Design a protein around this ligand. Structure first.
Ligand SMILES: *SCCNC(=O)CCNC(=O)[C@H](O)C(C)(C)COP(=O)(O)OP(=O)(O)OC[C@H]1O[C@@H](n2cnc3c(N)ncnc32)[C@H](O)[C@@H]1OP(=O)(O)O
Ligand SMILES: *SCCNC(=O)CCNC(=O)[C@H](O)C(C)(C)COP(=O)(O)OP(=O)(O)OC[C@H]1O[C@@H](n2cnc3c(N)ncnc32)[C@H](O)[C@@H]1OP(=O)(O)O
Ligand SMILES: [Mg+2]
Ligand SMILES: [Mg+2]
Ligand code: NA
Ligand code: NA
Ligand code: NA
Ligand code: NA
Lengths: 334, 295, 335, 293
């Protein structure tokens, strides 16, 4: 069976769950454990990518590039990836991550907006970085439309394009259809990936189905650490692909020990599909809105799940955290 | 000055044609010329429909005319304005640049235009800058602002190829102008494209770091006054709610803040109301034009 | 076609509670489930009627008193009980019927359907709806499973479930088993699926089961259940609604029941820790989890190592005693 | 002086295994094997071993010129209910391996001495023979408020009678844990496991014991009893030493001892994984020996 490459995003998507308060020691310990377990690519950035530190998303406690540098220093065999969102992070930020030793650039746009990334893919390829495109909130458009946007990324220099279930809103055949459309369009020259969230407890199944329909890159995080109810757990992906006799190169016992012994002790709380997270999956809300909605819930004295329901009704895209406050004010007046 | 300045518009596209409509309404600007390079231009056709002399023979043709304009507004590209700017200067035509060329000082009308009223060429910054810099200045004129950040959310259909090809430059130029025009010590600008249908009305959020003991009544009054000022040239520029104040948090590196939530509805001149980014640019450029004419 | 969700917060969840449910918790949970539109609510010791024991743990309150309280509280919901031949008996079932239970779920190991004949006959005589459970259904193939389902239907089962007791089945594994049962008994009886979360596949497996003809699906509020937990009732409700499949369960009400009624009494969150994932990977009966944790502490050896050895040995439901033998061996191996 | 003359009625799995065990007995000679089906295999095996065999039933047995001293019955509850009065009338001592339970329930190293003059004794259940010795080994040292057994058998060792009467195993065994084992309250669980190759039978015995119990004395008594049972069931072993646990809150003041047995059959007629049937025949042979003496 063709092998699948797992990218771990404990230290990037998981940054959302940590409110970007990772310490250098946590980054090093996590990188050490993942690398030794055979994980091939380890993503390290602010949750909203390079340049994400802000009032809108929250500031990283430690300088963003210092954490990337620490990850690169700790890594022995793993590549360090960084995430960049055009409109937030820039080519100058990418150059600073390359200077720190990152070797994989993952460049994310809303699913309908691939053409804003063409400069970033060009710069990443010029720097000798492996490139991955991310089409965020991929449930928002159909497979055909998604494949056209993937084609734009590949023409710009993307070596892989992911179907990204940012809201944890996709259900099984929805993933199949999107992955197959991308495989049909770009598969002869680029890889296809999938990144799932746990808001409906479907991340792992969606990942398996994505692989079975031609995806060769899959994301997870240790202990599900990530936005919303979390990401597909790296340790479960490793165990499940092994049961399916699909090679990942990740040692299952080492992945289980990394989750249990290294990551679990620093979790602020367990990733969990509570009412608020399930509403995100049901209504198609960007997962990283969760802790911002909880903060506004407390500040305005309204329920976080009602904030998120309203956000869902409105159709906001990644990065629109400011809209949470407007909604919370409205709800408090109501 | 009570008279009308004679104007040309160079670049008869989305911005140029919207500006044409606005200027035909202006108290103090008479559009005499619409200048492009494509004979089949929609903007040239609209100008001829509205009685304005139109030419696809470019700046060469404009500078040949017996009666040169007092003002030229340029909405072409950075490279085109870099080429044309010295020609306007040598002909003594004052230029308002709506492109990224930025040969002249960056201006925002209710903020810093007064110190540049005698300039031969002024630049309009960025569309998001025109929406948000007034608010950064409204805060920084009351209290020191160590850091100001703006988040611009625009309808995808209002982002043209120039916008899309040059997204990093929006973040960079706007952040720099937040600092040099807005008066913040440090700036950041984020832009988001949202494809919702029907197309969304532009939103802009402005966050300013402020002292914990700031007089928030005074800050609000200043913001309200600025919003009213901007509203006199962009009537759909509104506060979505009162400014929101929050004391320091560790997620904000110990900064206290004010957050201002704007909705920017276009006038629906040439462009639809969801094209608030283009509309504020042309409204601000027309206002700069009127202040230059009146000075 | 509609799907009927049976909720097992108050039965499979008993495992996570170490069988310490109070009458107040049972009543509040039943009240919330019933009002949300849940049609069948299972209430028993985790190992079914008669399960209170040294081997499995004793109930804090008699399960028959809990069943009676659930029946008293219920307005529209049926109360189900679980009974494992070899643990619970027809006498136990008659006590549950006396208390007002109206659904009998009879469970055997997947290869041993013919020990449940007396129980299906008795439940039908008592006018109870019957459901058969074929436990640890990953241990045998689809056609062998279907033969056992036929035995249960001939005995009087009105539905037979594919039960993923170990949370070990992966996607097409569920498809194949449900298809085989639907082919064999579908003209005569319903087919069900009960999933565990040890590999985070319970919800997906439930959707695939429905798509391949299952008409009954189990969940628990907050995933409360053995191992890493059960497919969450509130997520099943939300997901089936997204799929335009009728459940009769109000999604907002299910979400509120989970968040506001069940969550506050959870001993800890249902969670796929290393030990639970090992159960799914190695195919270990999910209710072994807390007993393995207890033995791990008692003997000074890791729970996940106990459970890996259990899976390798192939022990079946109800064999919790083997956990202790394995833990003693692991402790001796350290010396 | 010599051997007691025996008949076996019921030439099936248990009757035929018992035949083999008794043929190596120094106290009992099996003279008759009695069934109802001519095409039977215990009848054929009895014939191959020089034992007189008949498919004409107990009617035929009681017509023979030399009646047996002992009869062992391994038919069904119904059949032994019918036959028991006939043996009693004829003065033939009966050992009943069925659930009929006309006579007192006996477990050889526990209470057989009380019943040596009985005309009919009953062998309880297979699981009872494996576990009641342990309950007695604990209760003879300390009071036992509650005793619970967990029997795990190979699926291939569970015949139709076992499968159709699973509730009765739990009921009868629990009652005998009380009345023969000496616990105040009993419980019995049975589990069928289809693993291949077929599993060797396991039995776990849990006893509630006082929290200040002399656990050294309990262990010594358990070990003594295991060695006694091993004299007639050589494959009856402790998997590990008895395990003691302190009172959980939910145990309301009592502690526990857990005893882990493995019961491997002798491989006489039956395979070693048929430890359930084999302990029954081994125990019945022992009971018969002691009755013969
Ligand atoms: S509010 C967000 C605005 N975006 C940006 O600031 C990002 C950078 N974008 C640009 O530089 C745009 O080109 C600007 C200057 C903002 C104009 O935006 P438009 O959306 O109006 O762009 P159009 O392509 O519709 O219009 C440009 C018109 O100019 C004509 N033109 C090009 N070059 C010349 C020269 N040398 N002389 C005269 N006209 C010229 C184009 O042909 C076009 O007009 P048409 O008649 O419509 O073709
Ligand atoms: S160790 C677990 C034992 N299980 C139980 O105790 C559960 C209840 N089971 C029974 O009652 C069994 O029938 C017993 C007494 C346990 C016998 O078990 P077997 O496994 O030996 O059963 P078989 O079916 O192999 O043998 C029974 C033989 O008895 C013959 N038989 C029936 N009725 C009579 C009468 N009236 N007289 C003489 N023989 C009789 C059966 O025909 C059968 O022998 P075959 O010759 O093999 O048919
Ligand atoms: Mg994500
Ligand atoms: Mg279960
Ligand atoms: Na589907
Ligand atoms: Na130029
Ligand atoms: Na813009
Ligand atoms: Na038995």
């Amino acid at each position: 069976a063709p092998r699948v490459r797992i990218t771990d995003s404990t230290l990037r998507d998981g940054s959302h769950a940590m409110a970007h308060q990772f310490t250098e020691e946590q980054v090093r310990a996590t990188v050490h454990a993942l690398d030794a377990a055979g994980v091939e690519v380890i993503e390290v950035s602010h949750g909203d990518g390079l340049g994400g530190s802000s009032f809108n998303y929250g500031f990283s406690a430690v300088d963003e590039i210092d954490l990337v540098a620490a990850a690169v220093d700790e890594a022995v065999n793993a590549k360090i990836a960084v995430l960049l969102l055009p409109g937030v992070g820039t080519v100058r930020d990418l150059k600073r991550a390359h200077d720190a030793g990152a070797s994989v650039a993952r460049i994310a746009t809303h699913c309908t907006e691939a053409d804003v990334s063409c400069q970033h893919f060009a710069a990443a390829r010029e720097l000798g970085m492996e490139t991955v495109g991310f089409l965020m909130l991929a449930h928002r458009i159909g497979p055909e439309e998604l494949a056209r946007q993937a084609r734009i990324m590949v023409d710009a220099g993307a070596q892989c394009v992911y179907v990204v279930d940012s809201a944890g809103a996709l259900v099984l055949s929805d993933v199949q259809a999107r992955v197959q459309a991308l495989v049909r369009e770009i598969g002869h020259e680029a890889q296809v990936g999938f990144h799932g969230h746990q808001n409906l407890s479907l991340g792992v199944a969606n990942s398996v189905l994505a692989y079975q329909n031609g995806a060769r890159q899959i994301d997870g995080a240790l202990c599900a650490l990530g936005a919303g109810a979390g990401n597909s757990p790296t340790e479960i992906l490793a165990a499940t692909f092994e049961r399916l006799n699909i090679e990942t190169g990740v040692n299952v016992q080492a992945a289980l020990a990394a989750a249990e012994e290294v990551v679990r002790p620093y979790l602020p709380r367990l990733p969990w599909a509570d009412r608020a997270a399930i509403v995100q999956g049901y209504a198609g809300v960007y997962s990283s809105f969760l802790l911002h909605a909880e903060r506004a819930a407390e500040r305005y004295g309204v329920p976080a799940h009602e904030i998120l329901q309203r956000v869902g009704e409105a159709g906001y895209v990644g990065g629109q955290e400011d809209m949470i406050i407007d909604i919370a004010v409205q709800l408090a007046e109501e | 000055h009570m008279g009308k300045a004679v104007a040309a518009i160079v670049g008869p596209g989305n911005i140029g044609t919207d500006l044409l409509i606005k200027l035909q309404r202006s108290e103090h600007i008479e559009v005499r010329y619409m200048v492009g390079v494509d004979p089949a231009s929609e903007g040239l056709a609209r100008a001829r429909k509205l009685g304005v002399e139109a030419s696809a023979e470019g700046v060469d043709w404009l500078l040949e005319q017996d009666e040169l304009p007092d003002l030229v507004f340029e909405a072409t590209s950075a490279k085109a304005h870099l080429a044309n700017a010295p020609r306007y200067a040598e002909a003594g035509i004052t230029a308002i640049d709506l492109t990224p060329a930025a040969v002249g000082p960056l201006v925002c009308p209710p903020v810093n235009l007064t110190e540049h009223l005698d300039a031969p060429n002024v630049n309009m910054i960025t569309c998001g800058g025109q929406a948000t810099i007034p608010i950064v200045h409204a805060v920084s004129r009351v209290v020191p602002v160590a850091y100001a950040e703006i988040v611009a959310a625009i309808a995808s259909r209002s982002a043209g190829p120039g916008t899309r090809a040059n997204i990093d430059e929006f973040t960079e130029t706007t952040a720099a102008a937040i600092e040099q025009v807005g008066g913040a010590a440090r700036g950041k600008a984020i832009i988001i494209l949202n494809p919702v249908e029907p197309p969304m009305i532009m939103r802009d959020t402005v966050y300013c770091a402020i002292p914990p003991d700031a007089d928030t009544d005074a800050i609000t009054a200043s913001i309200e006054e600025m919003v009213a000022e901007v509203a006199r040239y962009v009537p759909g520029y509104t506060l979505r709610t009162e400014p929101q104040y929050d004391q320091p948090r560790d997620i904000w590196k110990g900064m206290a803040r004010v957050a201002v939530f704007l909705e920017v509805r276009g006038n629906g001149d040439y462009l639809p109301p969801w094209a608030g980014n283009l509309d504020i640019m042309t409204a601000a450029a027309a206002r700069v034009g009127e202040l230059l004419a009146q000075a």
